Amino acid sequence: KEHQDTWYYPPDIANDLQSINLPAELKGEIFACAWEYTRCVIPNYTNWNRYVAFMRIIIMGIIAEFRGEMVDVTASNNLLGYDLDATLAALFEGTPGHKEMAREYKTFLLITADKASERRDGELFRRYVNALAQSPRHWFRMRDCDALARFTIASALACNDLDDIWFTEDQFEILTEIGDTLYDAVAFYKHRAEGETNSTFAYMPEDLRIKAYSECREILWALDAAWARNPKLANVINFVRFFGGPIHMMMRRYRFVEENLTIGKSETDKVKLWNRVDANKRSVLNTQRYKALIARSEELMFPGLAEFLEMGGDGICDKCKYRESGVELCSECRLSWRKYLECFVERATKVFPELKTHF
Amino acid sequence: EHQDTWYYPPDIANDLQSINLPAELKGEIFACAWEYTRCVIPNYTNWNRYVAFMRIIIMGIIAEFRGEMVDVTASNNLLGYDLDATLAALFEGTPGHKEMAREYKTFLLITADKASERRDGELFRRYVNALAQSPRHWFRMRDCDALARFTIASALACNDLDDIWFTEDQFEILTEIGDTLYDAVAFYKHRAEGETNSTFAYMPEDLRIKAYSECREILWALDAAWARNPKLANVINFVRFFGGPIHMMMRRYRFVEENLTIGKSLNTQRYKALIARSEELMFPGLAEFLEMGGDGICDKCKYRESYGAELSHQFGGVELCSECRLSWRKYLECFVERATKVFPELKTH
Numbered sequence: 027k028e029h030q031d032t033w034y035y036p037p038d039i040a041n042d043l044q045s046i047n048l049p050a051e052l053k054g055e056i057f058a059c060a061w062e063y064t065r066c067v068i069p070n071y072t073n074w075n076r077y078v079a080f081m082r083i084i085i086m087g088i089i090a091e092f093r094g095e096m097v098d099v100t101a102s103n104n105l106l107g108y109d110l111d112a113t114l115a116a117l118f119e120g121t122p123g124h125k126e127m128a129r130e131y132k133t134f135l136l137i138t139a140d141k142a143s144e145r146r147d148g149e150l151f152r153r154y155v156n157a158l159a160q161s162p163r164h165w166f167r168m169r170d171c172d173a174l175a176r177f178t179i180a181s182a183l184a185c186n187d188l189d190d191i192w193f194t195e196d197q198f199e200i201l202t203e204i205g206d207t208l209y210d211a212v213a214f215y216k217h218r219a220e221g222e223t224n225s226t227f228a229y230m231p232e233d234l235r236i237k238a239y240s241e242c243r244e245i246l247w248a249l250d251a252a253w254a255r256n257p258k259l260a261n262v263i264n265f266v267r268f269f270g271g272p273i274h275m276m277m278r279r280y281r282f283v284e285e286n287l288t289i290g291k292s293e294t295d296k297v298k299l300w301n302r303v304d305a306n307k308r309s310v311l312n313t314q315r316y317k318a319l320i321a322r323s324e325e326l327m328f329p330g331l332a333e334f335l336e337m338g339g340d341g342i343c344d345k346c347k348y349r350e351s352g353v354e355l356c357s358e359c360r361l362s363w364r365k366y367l368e369c370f371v372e373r374a375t376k377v378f379p380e381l382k383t384h385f
Numbered sequence: 386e387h388q389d390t391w392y393y394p395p396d397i398a399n400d401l402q403s404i405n406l407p408a409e410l411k412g413e414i415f416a417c418a419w420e421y422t423r424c425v426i427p428n429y430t431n432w433n434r435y436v437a438f439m440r441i442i443i444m445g446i447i448a449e450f451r452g453e454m455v456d457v458t459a460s461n462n463l464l465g466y467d468l469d470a471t472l473a474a475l476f477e478g479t480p481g482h483k484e485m486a487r488e489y490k491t492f493l494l495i496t497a498d499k500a501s502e503r504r505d506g507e508l509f510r511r512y513v514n515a516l517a518q519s520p521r522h523w524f525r526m527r528d529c530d531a532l533a534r535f536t537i538a539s540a541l542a543c544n545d546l547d548d549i550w551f552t553e554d555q556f557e558i559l560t561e562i563g564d565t566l567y568d569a570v571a572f573y574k575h576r577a578e579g580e581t582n583s584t585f586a587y588m589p590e591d592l593r594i595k596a597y598s599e600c601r602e603i604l605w606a607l608d609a610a611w612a613r614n615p616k617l618a619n620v621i622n623f624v625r626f627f628g629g630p631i632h633m634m635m636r637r638y639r640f641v642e643e644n645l646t647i648g649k650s651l652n653t654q655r656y657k658a659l660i661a662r663s664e665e666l667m668f669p670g671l672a673e674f675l676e677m678g679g680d681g682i683c684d685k686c687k688y689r690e691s692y693g694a695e696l697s698h699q700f701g702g703v704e705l706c707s708e709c710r711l712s713w714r715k716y717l718e719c720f721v722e723r724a725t726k727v728f729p730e731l732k733t734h
């Protein structure tokens with residue numbers, strides 16, 4: 027009686043992973059997911075070879091997240107039978123950010139694969155998690171990377187052949203903050219259940235979730251109005267809008283249907299010993315891995331991440347509870363995070379002046 | 386708590402000069418036109434068509450707000466807009482200009498009457514009854530009520546895709562997907578509002594979740610099958626973003642107020658006169674639908690005198706019988722079969 031999903035995807039990717047022995051049902055669902063994500067958050071395309079590149083970037087990141095052993099962006103440049111530099115070139119060759127985005131993506135595969143493997147207990151991840159909680163601006167920069175937000179703004183530009191359009195770093199940070207805030211606001215109860223740490227409103231105060239969503243949505247509406255008559259920038263708004271919650275309704279990866287076409291929770295609704303032993307013998311906290319990766323910070327890490335890990339890896343703050351061998355913010359850090367959120371509107375109006383010259 | 390500030394292009398900023406409504410209302414209305422248009426037509430190439438579409442929606446919004454203010458019969462000049470002129474700006478040079486004019490005038494016609502004293506009259510009683518004659522008929526009329534093929538039409542227009550069109554049967558399936566997606570998500574809200582135009586007032590509540598899943602699957606199949614044709618992506622995008630997501634995205638809806646949750650809250654003279662204007666006002670077939678269906682074909686089916694007295698926390702149209710409920714059930718159950726006949730590129734994977 028109850029609908030079983032059949033997986034649809036274009037034949038371009040249907041014979042990918044010919045070298046990987048995953049059940050054929052699971053390949054289909056990975057391919058379906060990659061197609062569904064692409065179409066939801068990049069709904070317009072002109073360049074099909076770029077669209078397909080992006081699909082392959084998502085395929086790898088799904089597999090990276092499900093069996094981290096398989097996807098070691100440090101070890102080789104051939105991942106799951108794909109040429110990673112070549113696939114990224116297929117997407118970004120001619121675009122202003124190619125170099126910085128290839129670094130963005132490799133950081134994503136590093137942290138994702140390490141988070142979904144024995145290397146979760148390793149110095150590198152430990153230092154990533156502590157550096158998350160360093161400041162709210164740091165949190166969002168790193169949240170951006172975990173979600174491939176600025177990476178997907180670029181790929182959206184790219185896939186519509188908009189090879190000349192780009193953004194200040196301040197702008198990228200506001201755009202991704204809007205998307206990540208929208209997404210984490212909608213996904214709050216799902217993140218709490220499954221015990222997800224990379225969630226804005228696990229750090230930011232819960233009492234401001236509804237206002238933050240309201241303001242981020244209003245500002246993106248404002249920003250879209252300001253950019254009216256420039257269909258090219260409509261693709262940057264589209265990424266942020268569809269990413270920011272709607273994909274929960276549209277992609278089979280999410281549970282809209284299994285949860286009776288509801289999102290969220292009303293006010294009146296209900297609320298590895300041996301793996302840790304045998305990992306310590308294999309010296310899981312590999313500092314030589316960490317230092318080796320800090321050495322390759324021009325290849326594997328986004329601009330400033332190496333300096334972020336070195337300064338914040340052990341936690342800057344004295345009263346904050348950090349990860350030792352996520353972060354529980356102290357009350358003075360909770361208040362500064364709160365202050366950073368509460369003045370979101372000013373912060374975005376500074377970086378995007380066009381918001382104040384409406385008519 | 387959050388007090389909305391309204392954003393919209395300047396182009397329509399000084400629309401409705403002629404009309405005397407408070408500037409905030411006009412701000413909310415322009416906002417909704419802009420937001421609906423960006424949500425369900427998220428790409429454009431031709432700005433002057435985009436803006437016509439926004440004007441098409443502005444008028445539609447007010448028709449629903451105050452029907453008395455938009456009477457598409459009375460005159461072709463509504464709220465200082467020339468309807469035929471806006472429609473021409475949007476659809477001139479495109480396959481369905483003439484058909485989409487009718488589509489829209491029906492929408493204004495029916496929405497005005499729904500939201501006015503004319504809800505007690507003979508046209509609307511015949512409309513409500515006609516809705517429930519047949520499931521095919523239901524989806525065709527619901528299509529018009531939601532401007533589904535109108536907006537598929539508009540989305541091609543706004544992207545200068547003047548050569549692209551679909552058969553009646555493809556429009557019927559395209560809009561059935563979109564309207565089944567939307568009416569499955571909005572079930573409880575439609576029921577609270579005593580709506581007549583809700584798919585699951587008529588189709589069975591225990592197929593609501595499955596029908597959504599099935600429509601979302603086939604739309605993914607159609608999308609995949611349309612791989613490498615980014616013109617047709619504009620069509621998929623309309624059905625996808627219309628079929629639920631607008632509830633999250635538009636300030637028209639109550640996602641923020643509901644704490645970022647979804648689904649967790651006897652005179653004949655006018656009727657006759659408009660049926661004689663069927664070429665201008667009614668979509669191809671609606672006259673026959675209204676004439677054959679207006680009084681009800683079925684006899685175990687429970688109708689009403691007028692649909693005028695305002696209802697709440699219950700659907701406010703024909704209550705189908707044991708036998709009609711089963712033929713409707715069956716029309717739903719073969720949805721996948723019907724969609725595969727109409728778009729054979731589905732089974733040819």
Ligand SMILES: [Zn+2]
Binds near residue numbers: 356358360
């Ligand atoms: Zn602290």
Ligand SMILES: [Zn+2]
Binds near residue numbers: 709
């Ligand atoms: Zn009956």
